[PDB]
Scaffold this active site. Structure first.
Site, PDB file in Angstrom:
ATOM      1  N   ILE A 196       0.850  -1.195   0.000  1.00 58.97           N
ATOM      2  CA  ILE A 196       0.000   0.000   0.000  1.00 58.97           C
ATOM      3  C   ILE A 196       0.893   1.255   0.000  1.00 58.97           C
ATOM      4  O   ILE A 196       0.736   2.117  -0.866  1.00 58.97           O
ATOM      5  CB  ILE A 196      -1.004  -0.016   1.198  1.00 58.97           C
ATOM      6  CG1 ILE A 196      -2.035  -1.157   1.050  1.00 58.97           C
ATOM      7  CG2 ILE A 196      -1.707   1.342   1.372  1.00 58.97           C
ATOM      8  CD1 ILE A 196      -2.652  -1.656   2.362  1.00 58.97           C
ATOM      9  N   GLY A 197       1.805   1.336   0.968  1.00 57.94           N
ATOM     10  CA  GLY A 197       2.724   2.459   1.117  1.00 57.94           C
ATOM     11  C   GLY A 197       3.939   2.162   1.971  1.00 57.94           C
ATOM     12  O   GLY A 197       4.011   1.120   2.628  1.00 57.94           O
ATOM     13  N   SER A 198       4.908   3.089   1.951  1.00 55.65           N
ATOM     14  CA  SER A 198       6.160   3.018   2.705  1.00 55.65           C
ATOM     15  C   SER A 198       6.576   4.411   3.160  1.00 55.65           C
ATOM     16  O   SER A 198       6.401   5.379   2.414  1.00 55.65           O
ATOM     17  CB  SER A 198       7.264   2.382   1.864  1.00 55.65           C
ATOM     18  OG  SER A 198       7.520   3.127   0.684  1.00 55.65           O
ATOM     19  N   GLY A 199       7.116   4.504   4.373  1.00 48.91           N
ATOM     20  CA  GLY A 199       7.550   5.778   4.928  1.00 48.91           C
ATOM     21  C   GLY A 199       8.265   5.712   6.260  1.00 48.91           C
ATOM     22  O   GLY A 199       7.641   5.422   7.286  1.00 48.91           O
ATOM     23  N   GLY A 200       9.562   6.030   6.231  1.00 48.03           N
ATOM     24  CA  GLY A 200      10.449   6.077   7.391  1.00 48.03           C
ATOM     25  C   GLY A 200      10.454   4.831   8.252  1.00 48.03           C
ATOM     26  O   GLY A 200       9.809   4.809   9.305  1.00 48.03           O
ATOM     27  N   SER A 201      11.164   3.774   7.787  1.00 50.76           N
ATOM     28  CA  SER A 201      11.330   2.459   8.434  1.00 50.76           C
ATOM     29  C   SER A 201      10.003   1.665   8.543  1.00 50.76           C
ATOM     30  O   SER A 201      10.021   0.513   8.985  1.00 50.76           O
ATOM     31  CB  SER A 201      11.975   2.594   9.813  1.00 50.76           C
ATOM     32  OG  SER A 201      13.142   3.400   9.762  1.00 50.76           O
TER      33      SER A 201
ATOM     34  N   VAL B 195       3.254  -0.493   4.753  1.00 55.64           N
ATOM     35  CA  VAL B 195       1.882  -0.997   4.870  1.00 55.64           C
ATOM     36  C   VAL B 195       1.617  -1.885   3.651  1.00 55.64           C
ATOM     37  O   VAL B 195       1.888  -1.467   2.523  1.00 55.64           O
ATOM     38  CB  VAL B 195       0.815   0.124   5.035  1.00 55.64           C
ATOM     39  CG1 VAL B 195      -0.565  -0.465   5.322  1.00 55.64           C
ATOM     40  CG2 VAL B 195       1.202   1.104   6.139  1.00 55.64           C
TER      41      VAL B 195
ATOM     42  N   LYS C 115       0.790  -3.427   8.951  1.00 56.99           N
ATOM     43  CA  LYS C 115       1.808  -2.386   9.050  1.00 56.99           C
ATOM     44  C   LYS C 115       3.056  -3.025   9.648  1.00 56.99           C
ATOM     45  O   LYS C 115       2.981  -3.666  10.701  1.00 56.99           O
ATOM     46  CB  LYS C 115       1.330  -1.168   9.874  1.00 56.99           C
ATOM     47  CG  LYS C 115       2.443  -0.204  10.298  1.00 56.99           C
ATOM     48  CD  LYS C 115       2.175   1.241   9.901  1.00 56.99           C
ATOM     49  CE  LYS C 115       2.005   2.135  11.105  1.00 56.99           C
ATOM     50  NZ  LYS C 115       2.248   3.562  10.771  1.00 56.99           N
TER      51      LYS C 115
ATOM     52  N   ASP D 231      -1.429  17.259  15.650  1.00 58.84           N
ATOM     53  CA  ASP D 231      -0.967  17.243  14.263  1.00 58.84           C
ATOM     54  C   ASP D 231      -1.996  16.519  13.370  1.00 58.84           C
ATOM     55  O   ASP D 231      -1.688  15.496  12.748  1.00 58.84           O
ATOM     56  CB  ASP D 231       0.441  16.608  14.162  1.00 58.84           C
ATOM     57  CG  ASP D 231       1.077  16.636  12.777  1.00 58.84           C
ATOM     58  OD1 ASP D 231       0.738  17.544  11.982  1.00 58.84           O
ATOM     59  OD2 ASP D 231       1.896  15.740  12.483  1.00 58.84           O
TER      60      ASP D 231
HETATM   61  N1  LIG Z   1      -7.532   0.127  -0.853  1.00 58.59           N
HETATM   62  S1  LIG Z   1      -5.977  -0.032  -0.406  1.00 58.59           S
HETATM   63  O1  LIG Z   1      -5.712  -1.397  -0.014  1.00 58.59           O
HETATM   64  O2  LIG Z   1      -5.075   0.148  -1.513  1.00 58.59           O
HETATM   65  C1  LIG Z   1      -5.562   1.100   0.886  1.00 58.59           C
HETATM   66  C2  LIG Z   1      -5.208   2.412   0.566  1.00 58.59           C
HETATM   67  C3  LIG Z   1      -4.863   3.307   1.580  1.00 58.59           C
HETATM   68  C4  LIG Z   1      -4.860   2.878   2.908  1.00 58.59           C
HETATM   69  C5  LIG Z   1      -5.204   1.561   3.242  1.00 58.59           C
HETATM   70  C6  LIG Z   1      -5.214   1.108   4.565  1.00 58.59           C
HETATM   71  N2  LIG Z   1      -6.020   0.133   5.040  1.00 58.59           N
HETATM   72  N3  LIG Z   1      -5.771  -0.073   6.367  1.00 58.59           N
HETATM   73  C7  LIG Z   1      -4.744   0.762   6.751  1.00 58.59           C
HETATM   74  C8  LIG Z   1      -4.088   0.936   8.007  1.00 58.59           C
HETATM   75  C9  LIG Z   1      -3.073   1.890   8.128  1.00 58.59           C
HETATM   76  C10 LIG Z   1      -2.677   2.660   7.013  1.00 58.59           C
HETATM   77  N4  LIG Z   1      -1.630   3.658   7.036  1.00 58.59           N
HETATM   78  C11 LIG Z   1      -0.659   3.903   8.076  1.00 58.59           C
HETATM   79  O3  LIG Z   1      -0.610   3.267   9.117  1.00 58.59           O
HETATM   80  C12 LIG Z   1       0.341   4.993   7.857  1.00 58.59           C
HETATM   81  C13 LIG Z   1       1.491   4.678   6.952  1.00 58.59           C
HETATM   82  C14 LIG Z   1       1.373   4.890   5.575  1.00 58.59           C
HETATM   83  C15 LIG Z   1       2.447   4.595   4.730  1.00 58.59           C
HETATM   84  C16 LIG Z   1       3.634   4.086   5.265  1.00 58.59           C
HETATM   85  C17 LIG Z   1       3.752   3.873   6.641  1.00 58.59           C
HETATM   86  C18 LIG Z   1       2.680   4.175   7.486  1.00 58.59           C
HETATM   87  C19 LIG Z   1      -3.324   2.470   5.785  1.00 58.59           C
HETATM   88  C20 LIG Z   1      -4.371   1.511   5.651  1.00 58.59           C
HETATM   89  C21 LIG Z   1      -5.553   0.675   2.214  1.00 58.59           C
END
Ligand SMILES: NS(=O)(=O)c1cccc(-c2[nH]nc3ccc(NC(=O)Cc4ccccc4)cc23)c1
Length: 254
Positions: free
Chosen positions: A17-22, A25, A39, A133
């Site tokens: 889904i994403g990545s950010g500072g160590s 997700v 996560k 924040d």
């Molecule tokens: N439809 S999907 O599968 O593609 C999708 C899209 C967006 C969010 C979620 C998404 N689902 N559940 C999540 C729980 C936590 C989270 N985020 C963080 O805890 C912060 C973070 C972000 C990046 C790096 C490090 C920490 C996102 C979550 C799913």
């Protein structure tokens, strides 16, 4: 596309889904092919100050379960000296990405999302947590509603546009009202109150300095225009509170 093991249960990585500072997700699947969001946090470089921040965040997130459905569901978690695995509810999209992609938001959609935002911030305030924040990135669209993902206790990876004037002068639960006001202002006029001021130094001065009038163009929803004026008050004493916002005509009257 490796495998993850959390408290005996096996999960296969579908997509990141994403990545950010160590931190990272991922979209994951159990043995029954049911989706979850895991996560992953790498603790090999984090010191005791950063470690206690993650521990406090996990504790409050676990406690906030069953108290409100406006906070992300945390099914299970694993903490070792090297890593953190958090098995959470999988959402659709974060509010920050959804707001940038949207051309125009419906007045009913704006109201429903504002209510969810107020109720999530109210819940964290009732348990003594002050976010300080708040930004749209802290909110996630899941099961047709908005849910708060973090409480701002731990350092994570927009900009200074949502920073309250009290935090700038500090070099209070009312601080979260200003941040929420900026999100609703963006949902109303398509831009943040200080988005026009491109220079970061000039932006910080405009938020704290009085007489620097914030524009509030006339709209059909008179109650919505009132909320923004009450939320975006530089003086925290004159600023409206969360319990007062939950009784405001904009969220209670049809
Ligand atoms: N439809 S999907 O599968 O593609 C999708 C899209 C967006 C969010 C979620 C998404 N689902 N559940 C999540 C729980 C936590 C989270 N985020 C963080 O805890 C912060 C973070 C972000 C990046 C790096 C490090 C920490 C996102 C979550 C799913």
């Amino acid at each position: 596309n490796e495998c993850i093991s959390v408290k005996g249960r096996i999960y296969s990585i579908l997509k990141q889904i994403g990545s950010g500072g160590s931190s990272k997700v991922f979209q994951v699947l159990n043995e029954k092919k049911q989706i979850y969001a895991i996560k992953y946090v790498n603790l090999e470089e984090a010191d005791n100050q950063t470690l206690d921040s993650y521990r406090n965040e996990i504790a409050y997130l676990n406690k906030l379960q069953q108290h409100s459905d406006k906070i992300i569901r945390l099914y299970d978690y694993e903490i070792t000296d090297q890593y953190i695995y958090m098995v959470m509810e999988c959402g659709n999209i974060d509010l920050n990405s959804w707001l940038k992609k949207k051309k125009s938001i419906d007045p009913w959609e704006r109201k429903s999302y504002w209510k969810n935002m107020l109720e999530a911030v109210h819940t964290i305030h009732q348990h003594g947590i002050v976010h300080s924040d708040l930004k749209p990135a802290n909110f996630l669209i899941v099961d047709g509603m908005l849910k708060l993902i973090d409480f701002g206790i731990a350092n994570q990876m927009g900009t200074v546009n949502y920073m309250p004037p009290e935090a700038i002068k500090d070099m209070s639960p009312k601080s979260d009202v200003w941040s929420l006001g900026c999100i609703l202002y963006y949902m109303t006029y398509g831009k943040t109150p200080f988005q026009q001021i491109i220079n970061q130094i000039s932006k910080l001065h405009a938020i704290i300095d009085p007489n620097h009038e914030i524009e509030f163009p006339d709209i059909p929803e008179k109650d919505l225009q009132d909320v923004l004026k009450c939320c975006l008050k530089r003086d925290p004493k004159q600023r409206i509170s969360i319990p007062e916002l939950l009784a405001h005509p904009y969220v209670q009257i049809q």
